[PDB]
Symmetry: C3
C-alpha cells in the first residue's frame, strides 16, 4: 500500500504572480484527498504550511525575496523530513517551484540516496549570478547540486541549505525553454536530460525506459518526482505562470507518472505551479486543476488500463 503525506505549500514569492499560493486550495476542493482514498491509498494531511511573512526582504543583488523564499523552503524541508520519518510518500501541493529547494532537501535528510526526475519546460538551474530575471523559481536546482557549491554566493535566507544531490542523480524531462548559462551548466556538469527534441525523437516510452535505467542503474533507490505543471503543453495546463508551447501531452504526462508508480520507488512528489488566477476563463482553471489531479492520481496507482481489488468480481 502507498501511504502518502499531504503537505500544502501556499507560497508564491519565488516568482512575481501571487495566484499560485492558491494551488493547495483548489487542488483540495477538486477532491484530491477523497480521490486518493478512493484508491487503496493511506492518506494523511499535514495541512497547509502557515508561511512566515517577511516584510523586510530587499533583493540580494538581482535575487528577489530571498529571505521569504529561503525561509519557506527551510520550513518545508523540516515537514517533508517529518512525513518521510513517518514512512509516507511526501506529496507537496505547491505554489511556485522555488519550494523544490526545501522539498528535495528535507527528502534527502531522510534518504540521502534519492534520485530526482524533474518534469519541466525549464531547467530551473540558474544561479544567483546567471539568472537575468532574479526570480527564485528558476533557480532551485542550482542550490541543490553539490558540483555547483562554490558558484552560489551566500544568499540571505539559505544558510541552512547544503547541496544534497550530484549532477548525475537528476534527469530532466520536457525541456523547451533553457537559458544560455543554464545550457552551459547542463553540458558542463553532464546532466542527463530529455528535452522536447528527445521526446519527439525517441517517444515517451523509450524516454521513460532510459530515465529509470539511468537513475536506478547500479541500485534501486528512492525516487523524487518534482512535477512542474508547465512541463505539459499550455493546452492542458494553461493556468500557470511560465507557459511554453510544444509541451508534453496529457497522455505523455500520465505515461510518465504511471511508469514512475510501477517502479514502487516513488518517495517524494512535487505538484507545482498551478495558478488558478492565471486562467483566461473558468474552464482553463478547471482544465489545469483536473490535469494536475490526474497526474497526481497516476503517481499513486490509478492506471488507464483499469484497476481491481484482490477479490473475485
Amino acid at each position: 500500500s502507498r501511504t502518502i503525506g499531504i503537505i500544502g505549500a501556499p507560497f508564491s514569492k519565488g516568482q512575481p504572480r501571487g495566484g499560485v499560493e492558491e494551488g493547495p486550495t483548489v487542488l483540495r476542493k477538486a477532491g484530491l484527498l477523497e480521490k486518493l482514498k478512493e484508491q487503496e491509498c493511506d492518506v494523511k494531511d499535514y495541512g497547509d504550511l502557515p508561511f512566515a511573512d517577511i516584510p523586510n526582504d530587499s533583493p540580494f543583488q538581482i535575487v528577489k525575496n530571498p529571505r521569504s523564499v529561503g525561509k519557506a523552503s527551510e520550513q518545508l524541508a523540516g515537514k517533508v523530513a517529518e512525513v518521510k520519518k513517518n514512512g509516507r510518500i511526501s506529496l507537496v501541493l505547491g505554489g511556485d517551484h522555488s519550494l523544490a529547494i526545501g522539498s528535495i532537501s528535507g527528502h534527502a535528510r531522510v534518504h540521502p540516496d534519492l534520485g530526482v526526475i524533474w518534469v519541466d519546460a525549464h531547467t530551473d538551474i540558474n544561479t544567483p549570478l546567471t539568472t537575468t530575471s532574479g526570480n527564485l523559481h528558476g533557480q532551485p536546482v542550482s542550490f541543490l547540486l553539490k558540483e555547483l557549491k562554490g558558484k552560489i554566493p551566500d544568499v540571505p535566507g539559505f544558510s541552512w541549505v547544503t547541496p544534497c544531490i550530484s549532477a548525475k542523480d537528476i534527469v530532466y524531462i520536457g525541456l523547451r525553454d533553457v537559458d544560455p548559462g543554464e545550457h552551459y551548466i547542463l553540458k558542463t556538469l553532464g546532466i542527463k536530460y530529455f528535452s522536447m527534441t528527445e521526446v519527439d525523437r525517441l517517444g515517451i516510452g523509450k524516454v521513460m525506459e532510459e530515465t529509470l535505467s539511468y537513475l536506478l542503474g547500479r541500485k534501486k533507490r528512492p525516487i523524487h518526482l518534482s512535477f512542474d505543471v508547465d512541463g505539459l503543453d499550455p493546452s492542458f495546463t494553461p493556468a500557470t505562470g511560465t507557459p511554453v508551447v510544444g509541451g508534453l501531452t496529457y497522455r505523455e504526462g500520465l505515461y510518465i507518472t504511471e511508469e514512475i508508480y510501477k517502479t514502487g520507488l516513488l518517495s517524494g512528489l512535487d505538484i507545482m505551479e498551478v495558478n488558478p488566477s492565471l486562467g483566461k476563463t473558468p474552464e482553463e482553471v478547471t482544465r489545469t486543476v483536473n490535469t494536475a489531479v490526474a497526474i497526481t492520481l497516476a503517481c499513486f496507482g490509478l492506471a488507464r488500463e483499469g484497476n481491481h481489488k484482490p477479490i473475485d468480481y
Copy 2:
C-alpha cells in the same frame, strides 16, 4: 473491389441520452454513401432498421430497457447475416454500442471464425451483475464471450443470444476508463488489449502490428471492427455520450483503419455512438460527424498518401 452493405441502426435505449438514434441520419446527409461511391466501392443501402417500440419494458434487476435492447440487436443480427450472405461487408451506422451484440452475432452466424478489433475508451464488458449503471451499451462484450456463459443471467430480450467468440478472438484499442470488475475480467480471461498506456509506450504503428499478428496469427480470417467514436479524443469527436480525455488522435484513428483496410480482411464494421445532440455548438457536431465519416472512408480504401485508378494519368 470492396462491396459494402449499409445498415442504418437508429437505436438509443442502450444508454440514457436519445440523440444517438440520429447517427444514421447525419452520417448519410454528410454524404457517406456518395463519398464511398466516389471510391471504387460497391455500395448497397439496406436502410434504417425500423426498430420496435417496447412500452412495457421494466428493468431486470439493475439492467435498463433489456427487451428493447435485446430486440434491436436480434433484429440487427438478422440483417447483418443477410448482407454477409450477400457477399458484402456490413457497415452498421449505429446509435449506442449495445447494438454490437446484434452486429457481431449476425456476422458470426455467417463467419463463425471472425476476429474482433474493438476501438473504445471503454471495454463494454460489464455483466448484468457487474454493471453499476445498468446501461447496456457498457455490456455488449459480456453477452458475446463464450467463457462468460454461466455468469450472465437470463435477461429478458436476449434468449436468442449465444456467445459466438472466445476471449482470445478479441483485441481492444484505446482503453482509458475501465471499471474494476471489467479489469478483473480482462486479466482473468486473458483478453489482449492496448490501453492508452500501451499506445503511448509502443506507438500506434507497433500497436497495429501486434494487434493484426495476434488475431491473424495461425490463419487469415474475417475481421470485425467495432468502432466506438469515444475511442478518439473528445477534441475530435465531442458529440458522444461518454467522452474521456487523453484519447486516440485523429491520425491514430485513421492509421488504425488504414491498416485494417490493407489486410483485405475487413468483413464487419460498426461506426457507433455519434450523438449530434450532444455537441456544445454546431461545429462540434460537424467535427464529430466529419471524423466519423473519415474513419469510415479509411476502412474502405481512402489513403492519406493518395489513391489512383489502373490507368495511365
Copy 3:
C-alpha cells in the same frame, strides 16, 4: 556561422486568395530578422522583390495567371542565385508555393547537386494537364522534375525553365491530400515520401533518419527545404489557403527543422503559404505567424534543449 540571405517574395497569383502576398510583411514585423540576429546568424536582407504586374495574362488551357507566375519565379530564381553566389543560405519568405519553381531553380543554378525536402500536406506535382483546379501553387514540382520533361506543355511565362532535379533527389514529408494523377506520378517516378501514414507508423524521429540517409546517401550535398505552412496541422497554422486536418504537430515541425539544421547542409529555405487575411481571428493570424517564425529559427540553430556561446558562463 550560418549566413542567411532574406528574400521577400510578396506573390499570390499561384492561387486564388490574395492575402498571401502579405507573408513577408507580417513575418518581418514579427521580428524575424531581429530574432535571427539574436542568434549567431549573419543576416542580409535583399528586400521584398517588386513583382511585375501583368494585366494581359489569360489562362493557358486551364492554367491561371501563367505569365505572372512564370515571371515571378523567373525573377526570384535570379535573386536566389545571387545570394547563393554570395555564400549565404537563401531564405525565401513567400506568398504561394508556385514560387518554389523560381526558388529551387535559382538554387540549382549555383548548386546543381542539391537535394530537396518538401514539407507539405500536398505533393504540388500536378502537371498543366493533370491539374483540375488550374492553380499553379499545386504544380511547382512538375516543372522541376527532369523525368517529367515531355509531359509539360509550353506554358506562357516558363520558357526560361529547365528541370533541375531528378525524382530521386526529392523527399516529401506530411502528405495527406494527394490527387489521383499526383499519386500515379509518385508511384511511377518512384518518388520517396512520408505521408502522414508513415509519420504515424514510424515516428518523426525515424522519418527524419530515413529522409536524410536517403538524400545524403552516396555523398553530402546542399539541402533545399521548401516548407509549406499547411504541412502542419491547422490548429497551429490556420491562416493558410489550403488547410488539411490531421497534420504535423508543432513539435514534429520543430523536430524536422532542428534535424535539418544539425546536418550543417541547409542551403535553401522556403517559408510559404502564410496568409494572415485567412485567420478567423486576430490570434489565429498570430498563431500562424509565430509558428512560421519558430520553424524558421529552428532551421538556423535555435534548439529546444538550449543554446550557449563558447564562453564560461
